[PDB]
């Protein structure tokens, strides 16, 4: 019975293989036939390539020597080599040509998904090219969705050699019989066989994924749509940065490049933006995930107003100062969203560009107090229950599992009317004792949010929502600026409080603003749909946040 | 008795003054004296450049009203702007010309240093121009050295109304005569001496400070060269990745741009780097200060195999897959130094570049056991010591404040002799109860070691030095190997162990090696020398590390 498979990564978690240029070139360059793959295996086991891929000699020291093999071969041949023949640039080409072959990752995550430890077992080598850097991106991406990664060039063994078989078994603590090990290459193929291993030849992907659907009796062709990579809190870089004597703000790290940083709402977490994560550190950002004064690991002090906007906002700028960050794009949801308008028209030196998700941008409105324009609208009900200190606190407070339970849902899930919460006397006075776990979430999840909640509870995150006023006369002296820095409105059509025509009216104070749109949408915008939200993102911040 | 020193930001703290160019503009377009000045003014408190530096509206708003009044000037004067003028472009080039002007600067650090509060009051506008970063930068880098930063769009107010100035003094919580307030605008100078503050109309920098020398009593002026600027431990961005169940990595996190990672020696401190941490990220990096493993926050696990070459760079590969960094830049001294160069012959796909403070490469030899290596040179004695577990560690963690101040000196000061440490039965036994304090470090620094040492003590630092025939038979699975990728080796010349003639023979297997040396410096090369090794470090990074 199957427990593990195994993957080769050239021409088989990789394409187009870095083999198949040799012959690609011979072609192009009307080469004898093999010229090149021949001098590629020159002098075999005892060969400058098996040195390469055993890690004995580096990928620049090797290019002299298949120089050298390549001349050898061609003479033999009666053959001439042009003027301007590069091994290097050849290779540079093939390598930076070589991408993931998506469906055959799908597939491994799939089988990892359903209890089997994966591998990748590949014969590579040391590269100090000076694109090296390429090829390691395309490693660290791959590398993360498996067990283990058996390098030819770490372990001094290389495949065919039956050692490596035998260190590959022995770190999957596994017997052959409970292995797939699918290659491309059929000598290397063998000995796993040889050991009695379920093995794949690998030419089209297709074919190869219908034997392995076959043999472990997996789906993993004609599979629904995959949601993004998702983040193991335990797995992430955690850093701490005081803003005050009193605090402190936590945030999770992922990648490299201009800084992007994550602003949940409320009653969120770091956490909300988990699949947003991966996705943006991925496309070439550096992501730092909030939690947001209130939550989780950060600080949550007791008074009203410590929560209010431009409090909130100096901390924000205070956290850039200290982590000596002369700017970041700033992406925030909900409450997250409302802030990041705000460090728009407050700090815009500080805010490379700004994005919200659902929250829109409404000016504060001189000539009527925030507490009446709150009442105006039915839907903002909820708010008003929030303004009593205690109140909320102790229904949300009295059973954490269904608070989490009862708000992540589903546009079609909807367990809360947010229309009379104060008049029925809470938010779950008509909501069951034991909800039903929504399709947006697991049960894990949701206890990783009662975990972060045990901590502080509900009173600081109450709280920004109890400085209306405060925040009315502060936005007040914002009420002859524009917003002209790179700007994005996200709206969720399913969201029945931030609905996408409260943002209408959004290009009279930001006239180059950028939209996006969600379909079947609520208001949990990142984790309803977190496809489309990665492609909005991902799109807008190569367009316009360099 | 004055004990608050205030600074203008334009025309004081930075220069050329971004007013100045209105001057040298109208000279250079032969334009009418005054002209493009009279323009920046027009309207007064009423005007448009009022309502900017009030923060009512931000620079892009303000630049076409700014040229509605160029015109409106122009008109009166009966002459005419160039068919290409442009107050944007005007304004791009003198805010990207003007940079922090140094001696005064220093001469607010110097203050600051013997118990002043200072501060910079300054007219400002808000920001939202497309290349607003490089004045971001700029007040980043200022602020840091300062107790308050008042920006005149910040607070609603501007000089010369007095409303500021009252402002100015609660923010201070000092009155008038206890103030010295420097500017360049005398009608901005008024509003400070009619309330009994000591004012300095600042015109040339020189007279400025022997003016602030005069009325401080402080010397300002002719100072010897300052030290580079410190880290304050509790204001630092603190990271924590886990790199196994049991191990956890902590470091310190600085600035944007390639990734720096910096690997201190036995027995330190990510805090050893303090004097290159600001200077790295000021100079377009992202530092990343580790805390080795063993040492302050990182995890101690007991045994001596966790502590072997391979271990501790296959989880600082983990550390950069975890943080999401294809690459880092690695920087390392002492231990951290050999660490650095074995990170470069394993995973050179891992490292951008390589660079060893005193720490040569050697190859293994494999004739010969590390052991006897080791013996072959008297002044390795001290690592034969260490080899016994607990005969170090309790004489080490005896007396912690004796340790480090016997331990960190320059090489006039040095209390240990590294010759005959066995034979003497211990590192301080002709070393004094009470060591002086060398001019290397503050009691301050000293009690951080202290502190930090408290938690896991010498075992996991001690247990480096007791890996070193695991080391020997995997650096001669390198042999073969030869460092291709950017290196840069930085001798100190009075390093009596690590001496400068040990890299020698390096140029064999680093041949395109760069090198650096600095003159009269002990062991301890970062407090030692910070200026040459930061200018050394930035040199290298901008040529070779992109
Ligand atoms: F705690 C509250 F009041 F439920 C809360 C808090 C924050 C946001 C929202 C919210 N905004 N838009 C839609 C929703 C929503 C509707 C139905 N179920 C859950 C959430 C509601
Ligand atoms: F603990 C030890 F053994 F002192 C130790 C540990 C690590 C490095 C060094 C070292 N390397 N080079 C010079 C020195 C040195 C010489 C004189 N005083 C202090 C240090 C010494």
Redesign the interface.
Same mark, same amino acid.
């Given at each position: 019975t199957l427990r593990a498979a195994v993957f080769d990564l050239d021409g088989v978690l990789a394409l187009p293989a870095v083999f198949g240029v040799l012959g690609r070139t011979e072609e192009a360059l009307a080469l004898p036939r093999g010229l090149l793959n021949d001098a590629f295996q020159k002098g075999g086991p005892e060969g400058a390539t098996t040195?390469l891929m055993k890690?004995?000699?580096?990928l620049?020291?090797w290019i002299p020597l298949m120089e050298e093999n390549c001349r050898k071969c061609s003479e033999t041949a009666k053959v001439c080599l042009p003027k301007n023949f590069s091994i290097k640039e050849i290779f540079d080409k093939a390598i930076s040509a070589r991408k993931i072959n998506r469906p055959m990752l799908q597939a491994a995550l799939m089988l990892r998904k359903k209890g089997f430890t994966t591998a990748i077992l590949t014969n590579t080598w040391?590269?100090?090219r000076a694109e090296?850097?390429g090829?390691?991106?395309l490693?660290?991406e791959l590398?993360?969705h498996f067990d283990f990664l058996i390098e030819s060039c770490?372990v001094?063994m290389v495949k065919p050699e039956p050692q490596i078989y035998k260190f590959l078994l022995d770190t999957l603590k596994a017997s052959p019989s409970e292995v797939v090990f699918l290659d491309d290459i059929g000598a290397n193929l063998k000995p796993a066989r040889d050991l009695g291993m379920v093995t794949i030849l690998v030419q089209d992907t297709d074919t190869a994924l219908k034997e392995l659907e076959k043999v472990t009796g997996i789906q993993l062709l004609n599979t629904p749509a995959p949601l993004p990579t998702s983040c193991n809190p335990? #797995?992430?870089?955690?850093?701490?940065?005081?803003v005050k004597p009193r605090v402190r703000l936590h945030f999770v790290?992922?990648?490299?490049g201009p800084?992007v940083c994550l602003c949940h709402g409320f009653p969120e977490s770091w956490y909300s933006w988990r699949y947003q994560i991966?996705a943006l550190?991925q496309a070439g950002y550096?992501?730092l995930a909030m939690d947001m004064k209130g939550y989780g690991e950060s600080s949550a002090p007791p008074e009203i107003e410590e929560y209010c906007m431009e409090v909130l906002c100096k901390e924000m700028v205070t956290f850039l #100062?200290?982590?000596?960050?002369?700017?970041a794009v700033f992406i925030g949801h909900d409450w997250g969203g409302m802030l990041v308008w705000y460090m728009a028209l407050?700090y815009?030196?500080?805010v490379?560009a700004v994005a919200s998700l659902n929250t829109p941008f409404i000016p504060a409105n001189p000539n009527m107090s925030p507490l009446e324009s709150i009442k105006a609208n039915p839907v903002f009900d909820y708010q008003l229950y929030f303004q009593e200190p205690g109140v909320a606190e102790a229904e949300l407070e009295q059973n954490l599992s269904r608070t989490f339970k009862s708000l992540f849902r589903a546009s079609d899930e909807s367990v809360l009317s947010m229309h009379k919460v104060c008049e029925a006397g809470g938010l779950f006075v008509n909501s069951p004792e034991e909800p039903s776990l929504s399709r947006m979430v697991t049960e894990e999840e949701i206890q990783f949010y009662v975990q972060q909640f045990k901590k502080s509870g509900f009173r600081g995150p109450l709280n920004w929502y109890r400085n209306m006023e405060r925040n009315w006369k502060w936005a007040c002296?914002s009420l002859?600026?524009?917003?002209?820095?790179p700007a994005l409105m996200v709206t969720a059509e399913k969201d029945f409080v931030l609905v996408p025509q409260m943002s209408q009216h959004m290009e009279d104070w930001i006239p180059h603003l950028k939209r996006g749109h969600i379909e079947d949408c609520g208001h949990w915008t990142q984790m309803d749909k977190p496809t489309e939200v990665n492609q909005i993102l991902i799109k807008w911040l190569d367009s316009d946040a360099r």
């Open positions: 040195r890690g004995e000699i580096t620049s020291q040391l590269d100090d090296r850097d090829l390691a991106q490693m660290c590398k993360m770490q001094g335990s #797995d992430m870089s955690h850093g701490y940065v005081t790290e992922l990648g490299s800084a991966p550190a550096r992501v #100062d200290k982590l000596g960050l002369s700017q407050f815009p030196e500080r490379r002296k002859g600026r524009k917003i002209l820095i």
